[PDB]
Design a protein around this ligand. Structure first.
Ligand SMILES: [Mg+2]
Ligand SMILES: [Zn+2]
Ligand SMILES: [Zn+2]
Lengths: 49, 48, 1303
DNA sequence: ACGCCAGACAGGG
RNA sequence: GAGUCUGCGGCGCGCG
DNA sequence: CCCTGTCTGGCGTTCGCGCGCCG
């Protein structure tokens, strides 16, 4: 659940970069940012009630 | 010393509260025998 | 140096915001990382708030204390510690006003009620969204004259200022049908495609036409008016006084057409939002509306007059107290100090700051951006859009959550703790003060029984003591040679391997006669804390005395008790005089002891005093034959007659042994001739008594405890085994007869022997010890077959599905109870000394229902819902409780545990509410002279329809014990004087008399009828101090009462008690007869009807199908009498039978529950409380203030008293008794401090502010917050002043008087 | 989820 | 002739 | 315009102690 909450968070920002990347070279870093998934998963195993 | 403890000064919770309340528009002033001032904050409230 | 006697909340004047203020925070600059120093003028700047460092300044021109009160010549830094930084205030000057959310969103909109606007929706409408107002005069029309106070919009306001401006674009190359400044009318074509929509002057734009509601006046010579100025009819415009205007309006000097048009709109003053309410508020003359409301109030019908009355109190309170209402609008926001909301370094570089700062940033930012958005250019939509956000922000710091909840960015969806949040709730700021939560000289460890210990002392771990009495020890170290100085003595003790055995000597010496207080987990009553003499001991655990284990609900499975230490010689005094254990033996609830021997003691003291019985097969008649003595004495020596045979006068056991002196009897015991529980004859002081050795031994222990041996047998019964009650009663007697401390001696004495006898007795539970009756097999089979009959009776169709069930339950309900008495019957006749049994019989341990579950059978356990199971639990715990019977029984255990969890919370809450209303109640008096007393009934009406009966011994005792007779009563022969406090013995007399038939009631003083407004006197309260003599003046009765009710509650049920303290309409209501006549009933189909009637009128009582009425067609029914069956509604009963009836109802109806549960609390307490429920009343005939009002009863007694007595003109102040629940009386009381504690800090303060309320400190709640001395106790004005003398100083002062003779 | 109190507005004469 | 500064809000569980 | 009724709007919900975790 949290993993998919995180997937949505990532997919959230990736859509913003679909418009941000100038031309075609945008597969790697232009679409992915590991910040959300980490905070989400991490949050669950150390902070979840 | 083996002496007799002095007599209590105002508790900080009260002082901290009055100002908390002052943070809010409200004005909490202590008063005397005849409704007049008295000072909780020993002398740090008067200005300058 | 004066004493703070009165505190007062009042509204803040913007000038006062500035007056308390030091500097203005004008920028959102917390602290710049590089240097953890305050950034700029920002939130933490030190000018605005204070010295970031100790005594030192800024730059360092002056750095110590010599010049403590002067400021640096070049930099302004006055200094004390950084505390001056944490007490000073800063203010933020908001652009366009915003209002306090505390005043706008409280249920009754203080501004909505004051300002007649839609109390809740018109406000929210123009406060946060978009609608504008006209201040003094604006001569031109909208269609109607200028609106003095009403509000207009930007569009119709826009139109007005430049005339009637509406721009009409024209397509390129297209010419207009009007001249440069031609008069155009509504509907005229200004061009082929364009058509004007209003009258005015068509002006040419470079492309477009701008019409203007205006006239047009041409001029040949220069103009005297300028574009923008306002004009009226006559006012000159140009060419000298030749060109004059004819209408009010703005001016536009068009030098393109050499003309001056005067648009219809003149000097019009305008503004909206908080801005619109600030205006309205300023223009109100409270006096006028006051008068206005007065008329409105008393003259029209109740609909609009009722509104005016609730609208007149606020206007009142403002004018009255002074501090005027225009300050309800915020234009200057006070900034809480810097240190208060911590900007601290956490870890690695992490910084934590109180969330208040995030919200302060919010406001600052928005106000600023707004300042900039108004100066740049102002497009309406964007100005409002911001003022909105602005307005919301202002709420945020004040109160978050009233309207939406702000959050720190993605991390924690948590409401930033807003100022309201900081001041309210369970763990809030108002609650931190009141309960003052953390002692410096405190401790806590696990408790463990200390058998040899005397109630006087407690075993405290030396190691614990060392830290606890550290400073007291340090000094003592120096008094001796162990240490040179304090710092020395400290280092000496900073390590455990460094303590010389000499230090312990010192400590042992420092605690000599000092005492400490002990606390238990829930502090339910005053005995929740007791003082004892610490006797230093080894280890971790804290030794506690067994007898006190009852006061604090504490057993030894791990409970931990806290420990404090009285620092002052004053605190120690009281702590050892009036707070020590041994002096508070009786309970404040009931005059019954609390030092009653517990379960262990009683088991011992019982065992020793019981008589045994064994076998009678051959004749039992020694009463008459002398051959019966011989024969039955030889038959005993034989195997035929036992030493304890049912043989009337004397069983052979008495014939064989006769003991001269007392001692004589016990020596034979020790030598094995007679067991202690054996029946023998003994020669006492003047009688040949036939009593067992044990019984005689007990006699001695008591007689020894207290040397007055004759007074020891006067108050003891050696005619029965010593039960918890026989003992309970021996303590009480001993308390009254011989004196307090001497009783304490007796307690320990019993304590010691009960414990010893206990170990020797050898009572122990064994599996076989639980003994199953042989009859169980029978009763179960007997009831088993009967169950088949019930089944065969249903399988035929005789019994309804229901009848079957209800009948089967009744079969087990009876059969189980049958096995109950059976088991006990077995123990009684065959095993008098059964381990399990004796524990239960002795006050020791056990419960008749419990025993049953072991030897008998635990039979019916209900399902989840509540419907009991049809199948019982045929087993006992002796034999295997089967797999399912266990599961089935589990459901109940679970509801029990959930129930206990929710009762504990509600038990502490009830103690909170009782205290919220009865804390102020304290004994401070002189026999209050108003003799209006209460009569304690001794007989009760309907158990069975109507039959008079003597109330229970218990109940009646509860009502008259330790009371003060209001009037003299001559009963069975004795003359009970007035004012006399009837002892338990006296209340035994009156019952015996009612038995004979001489008294039906009892005139007795009670709190229910005291005159002392705030307080209760000695003659009214009564006896029960923790001691048995009259109540000492200065005793906190309110609390003592509140507590005695809140402890038993945890045993209850409670839901009713709540319905009772809180005037409510219970589940099953009972229609009370508002009229008193006789009753009569009807037969029609649908609804039945009970009528209280007369040949004049009947009080129609609609009694639906389900209601069971027991008043019949025929006899009388007084006002407030049950005409339906079940519970009653206090309000109605008040109306019908009156207050003197409500009070007594409430009281008895509350006692009904505790009674039924075993609790025995004195009526005094529930009275104290209930009184406060009615310390308020409504007004129907004014004098000083307007009619509809709910004010303090006694404050009217004041008013009426001096209005008829001192100042003439009998303006009778007619009132109406008002009933309120414990909760609402606390919510709505006089002082606010008390109210700020529970209800809604938010509301309580609002109102208290509006009306500059001066909290005269009386009562313990409000005066505790201040950390000031308690108005009750030693702060008792009665004893706060008392001096002591020595005959030596008495003469010396007289020598001072003698020297007064001059020459 | 709940319970309770107090409230402001809308429907039927 | 010593005294500063840190430990908060919440969460979970366990004892009484 | 009045009184009555109904959904509506705001607040509150033992006490103390341990331990451990987290921005
Ligand atoms: Mg326990
Ligand atoms: Zn300086
Ligand atoms: Zn009295």
């Amino acid at each position: 659940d949290q993993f998919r909450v995180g997937l949505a968070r990532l997919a959230r920002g990736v859509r913003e970069r679909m418009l941000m990347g100038s031309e075609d070279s945008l597969t790697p870093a232009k679409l992915v940012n590991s910040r959300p998934l980490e905070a989400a998963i991490r949050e669950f195993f150390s902070r979840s009630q | 010393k083996g002496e007799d403890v002095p007599e209590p000064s105002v508790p900080e919770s009260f002082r901290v509260l009055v100002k908390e309340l002052q943070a809010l528009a409200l004005d909490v002033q202590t008063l005397d025998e005849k409704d007049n001032p008295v000072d909780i904050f020993e002398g740090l409230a008067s200005k300058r | 140096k004066k004493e703070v006697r009165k505190v007062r909340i009042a509204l803040a004047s913007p000038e006062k915001i500035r007056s308390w203020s030091y500097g203005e925070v004008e920028k959102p600059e917390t602290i710049n990382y590089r240097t953890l120093k305050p950034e700029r003028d920002g939130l933490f700047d030190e000018r605005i708030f204070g010295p970031i460092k100790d005594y030192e300044c800024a730059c360092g021109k002056y750095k110590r204390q010599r010049f403590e009160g002067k400021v640096c010549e070049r930099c302004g830094v006055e200094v004390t510690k950084s505390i001056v930084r944490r007490y000073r205030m800063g203010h933020i000057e908001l652009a366009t006003p915003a209002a306090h959310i505390w005043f706008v969103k409280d249920v009754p909109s203080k501004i909505g009620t004051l300002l007649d606007l839609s109390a809740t929706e018109l406000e929210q409408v123009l406060y946060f969204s978009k609608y504008i107002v006209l201040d003094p005069k604006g001569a031109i029309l909208n269609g109607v004259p200028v609106e003095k106070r009403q509000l207009l919009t930007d569009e119709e306001y826009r139109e007005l200022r430049y005339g009637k401006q509406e721009t009409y674009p024209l397509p390129p190359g297209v010419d207009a049908l009007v001249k440069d400044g031609e008069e155009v009318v509504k509907g005229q074509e200004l061009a082929p495609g364009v058509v004007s929509r209003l009258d005015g002057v068509a002006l040419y734009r470079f492309a477009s036409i701008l019409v203007v509601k205006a006239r047009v006046y041409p001029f040949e010579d220069d103009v005297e008016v300028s574009t923008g100025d306002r004009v009226a009819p006559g006012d000159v415009l140009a060419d000298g006084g030749k060109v004059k205007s004819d209408v009010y309006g703005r001016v536009e000097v068009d030098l393109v057409r050499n003309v001056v048009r005067v648009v219809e709109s003149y000097d019009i003053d305008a503004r909206m939002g908080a801005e619109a309410i600030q205006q309205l508020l300023k223009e109100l003359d409270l006096e006028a509306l006051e008068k206005e409301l007065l008329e409105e109030m008393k003259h029209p019908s109740r609909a609009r007059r009722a509104k005016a009355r609730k609208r007149l109190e606020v206007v009142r309170a403002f004018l009255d107290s002074g501090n005027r209402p225009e300050w309800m609008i915020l234009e200057a926001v006070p900034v809480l100090p810097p240190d208060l909301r911590p900007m601290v370094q956490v870890d690695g570089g992490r910084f934590a700051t109180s969330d208040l700062n995030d919200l302060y940033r919010r406001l600052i930012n928005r106000n600023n951006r707004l300042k900039k958005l108004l100066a740049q250019g102002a497009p309406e939509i964007i100005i409002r859009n911001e003022k909105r956000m602005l307005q919301e922000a202002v709420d945020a710091l004040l109160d978050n959550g009233r309207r939406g909840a702000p959050v720190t960015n993605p991390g924690s969806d948590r409401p930033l703790r807003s100022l309201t949040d900081i001041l309210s709730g369970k763990q809030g700021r108002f609650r931190q003060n009141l309960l003052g939560k953390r002692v410096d000289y405190s401790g806590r460890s696990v408790i463990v029984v200390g058998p040899q210990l005397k109630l006087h002392q407690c075993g405290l771990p030396k190691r614990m003591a060392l830290e606890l009495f550290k400073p007291f020890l340090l000094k003592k170290m120096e008094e001796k040679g162990i240490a040179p100085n304090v710092k020395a003595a400290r280092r000496m003790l900073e390590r455990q391997r460094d303590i010389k055995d000499e230090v312990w000597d010192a400590l042992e010496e420092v605690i000599h006669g000092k005492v400490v207080l002990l606390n238990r987990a829930p502090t339910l009553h005053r005995l929740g804390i007791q003082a004892f003499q610490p006797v230093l001991v080894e280890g971790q655990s804290i030794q506690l005395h067994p007898l006190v284990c009852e006061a604090f609900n504490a057993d030894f499975d791990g409970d931990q008790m806290a420990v404090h230490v009285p620092l002052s010689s004053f605190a120690q005094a009281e702590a050892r005089i009036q707070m020590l254990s041994a002096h508070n033996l009786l309970s404040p609830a009931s005059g019954e002891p609390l030092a009653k021997p517990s379960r262990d003691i009683i088991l011992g003291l019982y065992y020793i005093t019981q008589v045994r019985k064994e076998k009678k097969g051959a004749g039992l008649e020694f009463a008459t034959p002398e051959e019966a003595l011989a024969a039955h004495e030889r038959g005993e020596v034989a195997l035929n007659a036992p030493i304890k045979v049912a043989g009337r006068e004397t069983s052979v056991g008495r014939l064989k042994y006769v003991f001269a002196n007392p001692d004589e009897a016990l020596l034979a015991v020790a030598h094995g001739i007679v067991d202690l529980q054996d029946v023998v004859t003994v020669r006492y002081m003047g009688k040949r008594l036939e009593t067992s050795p044990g019984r005689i031994l007990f006699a001695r222990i008591v007689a020894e405890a207290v040397e007055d041996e004759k007074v020891a047998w006067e108050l003891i019964q050696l005619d029965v085994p010593q039960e918890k009650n026989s003992l309970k009663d021996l303590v009480y007697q001993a308390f009254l007869r011989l004196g307090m401390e001497k009783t304490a001696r007796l307690l320990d004495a019993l304590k010691y022997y009960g414990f010893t006898f206990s170990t020797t007795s050898g009572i122990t539970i064994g599996i076989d010890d639980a003994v199953i009756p042989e009859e169980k097999k029978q009763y179960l089979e007997e009831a088993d077959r009967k169950l088949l009959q019930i089944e065969q009776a249903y399988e035929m169709g005789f019994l309804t599905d229901r009848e079957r069930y209800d009948q089967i339950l009744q079969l087990w309900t009876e059969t189980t109870e049958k096995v109950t008495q059976a088991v006990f019957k077995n123990f009684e006749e065959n095993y008098p000394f059964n381990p399990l049994y004796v524990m239960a019989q002795s006050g020791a341990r056990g419960n008749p229902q419990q025993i049953r579950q072991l030897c008998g059978l635990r039979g019916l356990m209900q399902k989840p819902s509540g419907e009991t199971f049809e199948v019982p639990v045929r087993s006992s715990f002796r034999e295997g409780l089967t797999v399912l019977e266990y599961f089935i029984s589990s459901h109940g255990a679970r509801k029990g545990g959930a129930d206990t969890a929710l009762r504990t919370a509600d038990s502490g809450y009830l103690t909170r509410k009782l205290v919220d209303v009865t804390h102020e109640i304290v004994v401070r008096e002189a026999d209050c002279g108003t003799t209006n007393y209460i009569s304690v009934p001794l007989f009760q009406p309907d158990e069975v329809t109507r039959s008079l009966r003597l109330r229970k011994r218990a109940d009646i005792e509860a009502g008259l014990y330790g009371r003060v007779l209001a009037r003299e009563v001559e009963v069975l022969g004795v003359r009970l004087e007035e004012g006399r406090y009837l002892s338990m013995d006296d209340v035994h007399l009156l019952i015996k008399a009612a038995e004979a038939g001489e008294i039906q009631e009892v005139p007795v003083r009670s709190p229910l009828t005291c005159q002392t407004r705030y307080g209760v006197c000695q003659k009214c309260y009564g006896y029960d101090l923790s001691m048995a003599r009259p109540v000492s003046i200065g005793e906190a009765v309110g609390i003592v009462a509140a507590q005695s009710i809140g402890e038993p509650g945890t045993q209850l049920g409670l839901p009713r008690v709540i319905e009772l303290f809180e005037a409510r309409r219970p589940k099953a209501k009972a229609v009370i007869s508002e009229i008193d006549g006789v009753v009569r009933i009807e037969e029609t189909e649908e609804k039945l009807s009970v009528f209280v009637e007369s040949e004049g009128f009947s009080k129609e009582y609609k009694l639906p199908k389900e209601a069971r009425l027991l008043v019949k067609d025929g006899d009388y029914v007084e006002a407030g009498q049950p005409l339906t069956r079940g519970a009653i509604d206090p309000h109605q009963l008040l109306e019908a039978k009156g207050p003197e009836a409500v009070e007594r109802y409430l009281v008895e109806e509350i006692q009904k529950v505790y009674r039924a549960q075993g609790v025995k609390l004195h009526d005094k307490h529930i009275e104290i409380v209930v009184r406060q429920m009615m310390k308020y009343v409504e007004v129907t005939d004014p004098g000083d203030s307007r009619l509809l009002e709910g004010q303090v009863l006694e404050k009217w007694d004041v008013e009426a008293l001096n209005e008829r007595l001192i100042a003439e003109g009998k303006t009778p102040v007619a009132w109406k008794p008002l009933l309120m629940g414990v909760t609402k009386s606390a919510l709505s009381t006089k002082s606010w401090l008390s109210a700020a504690s529970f209800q809604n800090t938010t509301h309580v303060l609002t109102e208290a502010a509006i009306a500059g309320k001066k909290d005269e400190l009386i009562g313990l709640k409000e005066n505790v917050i201040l950390g000031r001395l308690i108005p009750a106790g030693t702060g008792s004005d009665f004893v706060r002043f008392t001096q002591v003398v020595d005959q030596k100083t008495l003469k010396a002062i007289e020598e001072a008087r003698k020297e007064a003779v001059e020459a």
